[PDB]
Structures are given as C-alpha cells and as structure tokens.
C-alpha cells in the first residue's frame, strides 16, 4: 500500500528536467480523480525492456523506504514507457546546486550534507539495500539544509565507472562497502564544488590507474583530516573501508567545528540559516520529521 | 518565538492569482522567491483592505505564528508595506465550506464525523493556548487533504455568533462552542446558509425566543442533540471542546449509526500517497 498504481488520465508531463542512464525526468502534474487541483510531481520515464513482475517487485521495495534522507518511490504507471512518480524537489540535484552556488557554500553546509548522505546510506544498508549508483547527481536537494538520496533500485535495468569500487569494475561485486567507495567519490565532488572525477581519463582505463594506486587528488579546501576519510573509502580491501555508521559519527564531529576541517575563502560569512529561516523553509517545503 | 514569523520583502514574493476575499481583505495565490535561488514556492497571501498600527499587527502576528497544532493553521510570514500582507501555507483544496458544497454527493458519514473531530481538536488546542477564535465557520476551515482539515483566520458574523457576543460583545471559548455548533450544522447540511433570508439585525430576537437551526435531514437526533447543546443561552452549560472530541470520536467509530446518508475513507494506500505528496506534518 506504499505504491500507487496510476492511470494515464490522472497525470500529465509538462516540462523536461533531465536524463541519466535510466531515462527521463519531467516536472509533471497529478490530477486527482474528481478534484480540480493540480499537484506537482516528478515523473521518470524508463527505456529498457527484456516483465510485469520484475519492475513491480523492485518498485515495492523502492516505495517502502522511510528515512528523512532517502527518496521514496511514490507511484507507478505501467504504460509502454514505465513512468515512476516521486515527490518534486524544487532545488534540483546537489551536483548542479554546488556548481551554481560554489561561491556561496561554506564548510557547515558541506559537512552537514556529508552527514545527511551518510545517514541515508546507513539507512539503505540497515534495510539490506545496495544502491549501486551513489553520486552527487543522485543526491536531490529538498531544501539547502536537507538533501535526500535518490535513484535506488534501478538495478532492473543496467555504468558509472568513475564512481564504482575496484571490485565492482573488475568483478561486478556490489556491496555496502562498494557503496562506501562511491560515497567517497561523492564527497570529493562536493568538496571540489562539482569537479568531474578523473577528468579527461577514459572510463576503460579507470581500473588500471586504481590498481597502480592512483586516487582522486586532495581538494584545495580539504584539510588532511577530511582527505584521509576519502582515501580510506578507496582502499582496495573493501572490509578495510569505513562503515556508514562510522562516517556519520566522524562527519558529525567535524560539523561541530567546521572551520577546523574545511578551509574555504570567506567561510565565516556564510552560516546555516537562522532558526527563523529554517522554520520558514520547513513549514512551506519540508514538513517531514 | 520571534523566529516563528518571517519578515518578508516586497521583492521576494509576488501575487499571481486571486483566490477570494473576506471581511478584512483579499487572499491571493502567490509565489515566494528565496533570495539567491531560482525556485518559486507557492504561498497564500492575505492583503488587508485598509507603521505603528503595525506594532499592533506584529504583536498579534507573533501569537498567530506561535500556534502549532496539526488541525490549526500557522501564520508563517508578514510584509509591511502600505496594506499589510500576511503569508501562510497554500491549501490546494480550499476551504471545507466550498468543498462540502461541491462534493455533497460523494461525502459519507465517516468523512463528516472525522472533520467534526478534527475541528474540535484544533479548537481545544486554541483554548489550551487561551486563544479565542471569534470567527469559527465552515468558511474558515481549510482542507489540506480531504482527510485533514485545519482551522484558520484568527487574530460581524452575526449568524455564527453566540447570543452573549451579539448582545454584549462577550467572546469566550464557550462562545466559540456556539460557533462550532453552527459550523457542524453547515457541514451536515452540505453547506446550507444558516437562517437563510433572515436579516442579521433580527437574529438576536429569534434566539432569545428559543428558535434554533433545524435538524439536518442526515442528522440523527444524537448529533442534533449535541448541536442544540452548543446553542444554550447559558454559556457554561454548553459542552467543552475536550468533551466534543470524545463524543464525536465515539460516533466516528460507528458512523452509520449516527448519520443517515443516502449511498453511505481512503485505503491506507491512498492516505500514504496523499501525505507523502501534500501532508508530511505529524499528527
Ligand atoms: C543534477 C542533474 C540531474 O540529476 N538531472 C536529471 C533530472 N532529475 C531531477 N530533478 C528534480 N528537481 C528539479 C530540477 N530542476 C531543474 N527543477 C526541479 O524541480 C522543479 C527532481 N525532483 C524529484 N526528482 C525525482 C527529480 N529529479 C533527475 C535526473 F534524471
Ligand atoms: C469556503 C470559503 C472561501 O472560499 N473563502 C475564500 C478562500 N480563501 C482561501 N483559500 C485557500 N485555498 C484555496 C482556495 N482556492 C479557490 N484555491 C486554493 O488553493 C489553490 C487558502 N489557503 C490559505 N489561505 C489563507 C486560503 N484562503 C479565503 C477566502 F478568500
């Protein structure tokens, strides 16, 4: 009862928002039968085909998540392009957000985003769910103070080589510890204000340079404390990498003294919003717990 | 406290479409544009019709912004220009009065009785906060979702007023109980006008002589018994909102025993879908 089966006639796609490997996302409108209102939604149109048991069985798990930092699948319409319905996130993806606001993001926002993504990932691990596609492009901004992990369970379809752990590239092993690798790359994206990992290196070569010990470089704003966490996420031995429960504690500790661990020009100028502005955001856009 | 009311600039929101007007001004559907961002967030804007009277407005606006109950609307922001503009959350379904009129052939007893419970819960909170509504009516109950209504517009409606309010300008929580009875009558009549065609200047006379709103056709006597008790001349003899919650909740557990509707809730599937999209606040 956590996945609504929708009819073609009760929603409409109105504007294209973007695409990735698993199809196209639209801003759409849900029109409840009998009512006069139009409710904004996000619609993902898929494009892979090989069942009416495959997609639904995974969608049910997708609709079952319950964590403030994990996006929940809300509905589905089984047409020819299967359309998945979720909540609309007015701010877009975190990657573009950091790129567009890279001159307005202080250490407190960056570290709190790291904490929240780790909380969302720890939730997925607790539920025995492997993401397989964690990246800055798959973190949605609900409010600037509240981010949520998206695009989970689209393993019914198909690769993000430059975010994948070495054992995933070589052996197609996907575990929670391989998610820890992708988490490290996601943190690198945020701390570089949206740089492209291994920029200009063909994907067919990533496993080679990883085997020889090359890793993503230290972002200029990172102290050695933060970069060591990222490097530990990229250890070849998956069991030696940190766990999401541990990443929550460490990044939460750094978030209590953010200017000690990130060196950003003009940091003390940007703070978290006052309780006035957070209460205003939550009342209008973010009423969940 | 002070951080529960946002002071907005003219340049960070825009009125886009009129929704209606009431006693004190006009309500618009609007868009809030956060400074520095590209997003447009829908809001409701109430612009009054008529700097230091603003000290009056602000002192009450802070109290309006301090209420916090799942069935009570909270004032969110204010913009002080010429005419003062008040900002709250937009309710895509509108009020309960127009909703019951437009859906009067699809509303069952369970919805009606649960609405009575929820309005009573919101009023009991206001009494707990020692706040007198003074303008309770079906037109001032907003529909967040069909399963979730909230009381709005606090901080003359003769046909909703208790007799002591008409005669002596006495407003108490027990006079709110009178208005609650009239609000329940509106819902049970599917949006009928109280004392239709009777001039407001004559209402106090008919009340003193014992005339009351008639029993709605769908109302069983148990429900009409409650409504009549809300309209007793002795304000202390009327029920309390804490008691109204218990009684209407009891009837809501056997709704077809207490309301007789020709052709008489959503599945947990549909409620979970509504709440995720429109109503994440905890209740
Ligand atoms: C950042 C790159 C990216 O991930 N692109 C596409 C589209 N995605 C997406 N975006 C939003 N919110 C959004 C973006 N823009 C420009 N406007 C809005 O909202 C009005 C979103 N909300 C919910 N979901 C599921 C979204 N997806 C996902 C990628 F496919
Ligand atoms: C039933 C009595 C009445 O109609 N009073 C009008 C409506 N106003 C009002 N409406 C809404 N929600 C709403 C109304 N319509 C036609 N569309 C929507 O949503 C798109 C509302 N939300 C918050 N506030 C303060 C509202 N006021 C008030 C009177 F003008």
């Amino acid at each position: 009862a956590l996945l609504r089966i929708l009819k073609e006639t009760e929603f409409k796609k109105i504007k294209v928002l973007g695409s990735g490997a698993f199809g196209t996302v639209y801003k759409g409108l849900w029109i409840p039968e009998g009512e006069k209102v139009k409710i904004p939604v996000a619609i993902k149109e898929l494009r892979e085909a090989t069942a009416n048991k495959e997609i639904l069985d995974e969608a049910y798990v997708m609709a079952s998540v319950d964590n403030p930092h994990v996006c929940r699948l809300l509905g589905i319409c089984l047409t020819s392009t299967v359309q998945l319905i979720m909540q609309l996130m007015p701010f877009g993806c975190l990657l573009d957000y950091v790129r567009e606001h890279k001159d307005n993001i202080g250490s407190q926002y960056l570290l709190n985003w790291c904490v929240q993504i780790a909380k969302g990932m720890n939730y997925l691990e607790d539920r025995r769910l492997v993401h397989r596609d964690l990246a800055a492009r798959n973190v949605l901004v609900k409010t600037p103070q509240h981010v949520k992990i998206t695009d989970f369970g689209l393993a019914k379809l198909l690769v993000p080589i430059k975010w994948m752990a070495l054992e995933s590239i070589l052996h197609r092993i996907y575990t929670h510890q391989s998610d820890v690798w992708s988490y490290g790359v996601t943190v690198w994206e945020l701390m570089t204000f949206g740089s492209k990992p291994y920029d200009g290196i063909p994907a067919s070569e990533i496993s080679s340079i990883l085997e020889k010990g090359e890793r993503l470089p230290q972002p200029p704003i990172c102290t050695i404390d933060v970069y060591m966490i990222m490097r530990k996420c990229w250890m070849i031995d998956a069991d030696s990498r940190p766990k999401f429960r541990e990443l929550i504690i460490e990044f939460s500790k750094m978030a209590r003294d953010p200017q000690r661990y990130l060196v950003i020009q003009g940091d003390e100028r940007m703070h978290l919003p006052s309780p006035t502005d957070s209460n205003f955001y939550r009342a209008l856009m973010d009423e969940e717990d």
Side-chain angles (χ1 to χ4, degrees), chain A:
Chain A
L2 293 172
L3 184 67
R4 165 135 174 177
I5 318 299
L6 296 156
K7 307 176 51 181
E8 277 184 51
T9 57
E10 64 186 300
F11 69 97
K12 299 294 178 285
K13 301 175 280 308
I14 70 188
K15 182 197 180 182
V16 185
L17 299 179
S19 54
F22 329 104
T24 335
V25 173
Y26 303 81
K27 150 146 185 151
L29 290 174
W30 171 51
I31 303 92
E33 285 181 353
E35 306 286 353
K36 294 179 179 179
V37 306
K38 305 177 287 169
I39 307 305
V41 295
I43 301 163
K44 184 165 264 264
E45 288 231 284
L46 306 187
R47 281 188 304 267
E48 152 74 320
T50 72
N52 246 41
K53 186 177 182 180
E54 263 177 88
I55 299 174
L56 278 173
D57 287 341
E58 274 195 353
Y60 295 145
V61 180
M62 275 176 248
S64 75
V65 300
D66 183 12
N67 190 273
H69 303 106
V70 180
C71 291
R72 183 171 91 76
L73 173 66
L74 306 184
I76 191 173
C77 184
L78 298 164
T79 53
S80 291
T81 59
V82 64
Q83 304 181 61
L84 307 150
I85 284 76
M86 284 184 286
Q87 188 180 35
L88 184 70
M89 305 284 182
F91 284 98
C93 75
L94 188 55
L95 176 59
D96 286 349
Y97 186 86
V98 181
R99 288 175 173 169
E100 294 173 14
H101 296 79
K102 64 181 297 177
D103 297 308
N104 290 93
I105 295 175
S107 56
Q108 192 76 77
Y109 270 97
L110 283 166
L111 292 174
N112 275 101
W113 290 336
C114 293
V115 172
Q116 293 176 31
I117 296 165
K119 285 181 175 178
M121 294 301 298
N122 179 251
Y123 176 83
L124 290 183
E125 178 171 9
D126 295 337
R127 291 285 303 281
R128 310 262 144 61
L129 288 12
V130 175
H131 191 314
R132 301 165 183 257
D133 196 13
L134 180 61
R137 75 179 162 266
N138 283 330
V139 177
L140 294 175
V141 182
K142 184 164 190 197
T143 71
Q145 302 81 39
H146 180 186
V147 298
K148 307 178 68 153
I149 287 147
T150 187
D151 281 3
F152 148 80
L154 300 181
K156 239 7 134 173
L157 322 165
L158 255 181
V159 290
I161 290 290
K162 297 178 177 178
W163 284 260
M164 288 165 59
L166 185 57
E167 71 269 16
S168 306
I169 300 173
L170 297 179
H171 305 298
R172 316 198 154 144
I173 295 175
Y174 293 87
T175 69
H176 302 112
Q177 289 313 100
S178 61
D179 278 349
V180 172
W181 185 297
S182 302
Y183 176 86
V185 183
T186 302
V187 173
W188 185 88
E189 290 178 281
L190 303 187
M191 299 299 176
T192 59
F193 299 100
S195 294
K196 303 167 78 172
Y198 322 97
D199 202 358
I201 302 317
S204 67
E205 284 176 320
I206 292 296
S207 62
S208 299
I209 79 175
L210 291 177
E211 281 166 334
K212 298 187 184 64
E214 186 177 349
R215 295 296 184 278
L216 290 168
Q218 182 175 356
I221 69 171
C222 288
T223 59
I224 192 58
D225 297 29
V226 182
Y227 188 50
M228 272 308 300
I229 297 170
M230 297 169 40
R231 291 296 292 255
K232 284 154 75 156
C233 295
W234 306 324
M235 288 185 191
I236 184 169
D237 182 14
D239 279 331
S240 300
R241 300 165 197 158
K243 300 274 270 98
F244 283 123
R245 178 194 305 269
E246 301 166 354
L247 292 166
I248 295 171
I249 299 167
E250 183 139 23
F251 275 99
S252 296
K253 181 186 179 181
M254 292 185 290
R256 285 184 279 272
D257 191 10
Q259 307 209 358
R260 180 189 181 179
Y261 299 98
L262 294 178
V263 175
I264 301 176
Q265 287 177 3
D267 197 6
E268 339 103 60
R269 186 151 217 234
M270 350 162 195
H271 294 289
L272 282 186
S274 68
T276 314
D277 303 343
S278 293
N279 294 336
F280 197 70
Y281 259 115
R282 296 187 54 173
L284 286 174
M285 314 183 46
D286 188 15
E287 294 178 299
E288 67 177 312
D289 273 336

